[PDB]
Amino acid sequence: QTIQPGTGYNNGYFYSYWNDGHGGVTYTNGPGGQFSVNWSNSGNFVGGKGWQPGTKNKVINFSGSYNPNGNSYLSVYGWSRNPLIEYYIVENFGTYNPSTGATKLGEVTSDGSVYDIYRTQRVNQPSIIGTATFYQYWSVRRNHRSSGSVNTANHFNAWAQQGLTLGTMDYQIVAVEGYFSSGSASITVS
Ligand code: NA
Ligand code: NA
């Protein structure tokens, strides 16, 4: 169903839906690993389904329709603890590339495309443990797609070889994120 911000479990999958207080976002959980989101001139929001906790070797499948009208991402997204890391494996995005506000460490050729690897430091920002300073890791897919499989180990291992350490996994989802834009998306995760 259409729900408010929060986390929980639906039809066998963990879900997280968060936003910054700006309206215009409707997030809806569907059967199995499906969710859909429709946003009209939202602020920043992140919503999707997956697992709690994630793993460092999960092969994640996703498929659906993704129609962003502005700044938005479709990613495998999650966190670790000790160290506290927020990470992204971006499979598709709108008008804004993550490369802008991050620093490139290398590349990895995975699941049919080269991805550029970046790290950014979030200073005194919101997190799964409250206001904190922590690193963000990115793999950004050069060839955007709306379906396929992501072997997360390819990215975690590549990040490790570049000196990017991951802690013990917290949640791991396929998420649609928007940032002051509009759009629609419907995705099934497994
Ligand atoms: Na795109
Ligand atoms: Na801040």
Map residue 83 onto helix, strand or coil: coil
Chain centroid to CA 21: how far? 19
Asked if 91 is an active-site residue, the reply is no
Out of 86, 91, 111, 116, pick the active-site residue: 86
Ligand nearest to the CA of 91: 1
Give me the resolution in angstroms, 1 decimal: 1.1
Tokens of 168: 């013990």
Ligand nearest to the CA of 90: 1
Asked if 177 is an active-site residue, the reply is yes
Out of 91, 111, 116, 177, pick the active-site residue: 177
Chain centroid to CA 27: how far? 15
Alpha-carbon gap, residue 142 to 91, rounded angstroms:
8
Q: Which residues crowd ion ligand 1, with CB under 5 Å?
A: 92, 144
Tokens of 126: 């919101």
Yes or no: say if 187 and 35 are a contact pair by the CB < 8 Å rule. yes
Q: How far is the CA of 92 from the centre of ligand 1 (A)?
A: 5
Q: How far is the CA of 190 from the centre of ligand 2 (A)?
A: 34
Which residues are CB-neighbours of 111 under 8 A, at least 6 positions away?
Answer: 148, 149, 150, 151, 154
Alpha-carbon gap, residue 67 to 183, rounded angstroms:
6
Q: Could you tell me the domains of the chain?
A: 2-190 (2.60.120.180)
Handedness of CA 49, 47, 164, 118 (dihedral sign): positive
Yes or no: say if 32 and 188 are a contact pair by the CB < 8 Å rule. yes
Report strand pairing: 103-110 vs 113-125: antiparallel
Q: How was this structure determined?
A: X-ray
Backbone angles phi, psi at 161, to 5 degrees: -65, -20
